[PDB]
């Protein structure tokens, strides 16, 4: 069991997209953006005791950020783990 | 924008031993 | 290393000269041989690697004197 102090840090924001705006209705899935030290335990216990909702199974990946050039000098945005969280039958977020 | 200014190719000493004078 | 366990006789370097007095870079090697030493005050055989000067200082300065000094100086037998 993951303690609440470690649990409460694992999220930043939900993630707006077209594939979020398809996976919300046509397959009922949600698109997190978690911290980089997050495993399937630290999101399967983290969608549950943070919205008081349930979960079917979780999936993630490690998006590597693009390369930006502000001015004439190079720049590298921070990487960020994108989590796909499938919700059970009979679930609906706030 | 801007650009560089290239130089200094390996110019192969510009010749073989062409002028065989012997 | 070619280092005598008693004297501290480290190898040094000189120049091998000649009848025409030339110059090169030689080494001088100390005279090491392995040896076993009887002791009665411990009643055993102690192994040692020792110079040729060491194998005659060991019959004057007492065997157990050197065998006690080598515990203190820092070079174990």
């Amino acid at each position: 069991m993951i303690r609440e102090e470690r649990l409460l840090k694992v999220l930043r924001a939900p993630h707006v997209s077209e594939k979020a705006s398809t996976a919300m209705e046509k397959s009922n899935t949600i698109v997190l953006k978690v911290a980089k030290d997050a495993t399937k335990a630290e999101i399967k216990a983290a969608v549950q005791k943070l919205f008081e909702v349930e979960v079917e199974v979780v999936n993630t990946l490690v998006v590597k950020g693009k390369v930006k050039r502000h001015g004439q000098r190079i720049g590298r945005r921070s990487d960020w783990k994108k989590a796909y969280v499938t919700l059970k039958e009979g679930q609906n977020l706030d | 924008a801007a650009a560089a200014a290239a130089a200094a190719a390996a110019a192969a000493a510009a010749a073989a031993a062409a002028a065989a004078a012997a | 290393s070619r280092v005598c366990q008693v004297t501290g006789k480290r190898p040094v370097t000189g120049n091998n000269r000649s009848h025409a007095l030339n110059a090169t870079k030689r080494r001088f090697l100390p005279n090491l041989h392995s040896h076993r030493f009887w002791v009665e005050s411990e009643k055993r055989f102690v192994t040692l690697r020792v110079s040729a000067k060491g194998m005659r200082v060991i019959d004057k300065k007492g065997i157990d004197t050197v065998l006690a000094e080598l515990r203190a100086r820092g070079e174990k037998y």
């Binding site: 609440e4 102090e5 409460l8 999220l11 930043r12 924001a13 939900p14 707006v16 943070l50 | - | -």
Partner: protein
């Protein structure tokens, strides 16, 4: 604030901090939205994270 929070328990702060973390995480989840039109709420809540989490070590093991 710490001159007020200094006279609290060893264990009452270990509910105070979790309540601050709950509302901090609420503020971080609303920080997704383009609705959270208060800037300094997040930073002052981070400072209240700081003072509490250093009084935690200033009492628990000092």
């Amino acid at each position: 604030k710490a001159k007020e929070l200094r006279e609290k328990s060893v264990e009452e702060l270990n509910t105070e901090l979790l309540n601050l973390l709950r509302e901090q995480f609420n503020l971080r989840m609303q920080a997704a939205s383009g609705q959270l039109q208060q800037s300094h709420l997040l930073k002052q809540v981070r400072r209240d994270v700081a003072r509490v989490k250093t009084l935690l070590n200033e009492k628990a093991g000092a």
